[PDB]
């Protein structure tokens, strides 16, 4: 039986921040990933 092998997902993490002088509240971009499996 034919088995397609795919390496399981990867992607860089983009971090959006304002100035640390302004705030420490930050946001995270997961790129090229539909966030159906976020946690790992």
């Amino acid at each position: 039986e034919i088995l397609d092998i795919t390496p399981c997902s990867f992607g860089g993490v983009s971090v959006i921040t304002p100035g640390t002088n302004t705030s420490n509240q930050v946001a995270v971009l997961y790129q090229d990933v539909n966030c159906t499996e976020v946690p790992v």
């Binding site: 795919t6 990867f10 992607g11 860089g12 790129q31």
Partner: peptide
């Protein structure tokens, strides 16, 4: 008239450009 794979598996990320095709037409 202007036309390897869509998926690459070793750290080859093509990034989306900031300015989309629609607003360049705008």
């Amino acid at each position: 008239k202007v036309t390897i794979c869509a998926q690459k598996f070793n750290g080859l990320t093509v990034l989306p450009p900031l300015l989309t095709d629609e607003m360049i037409a705008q």
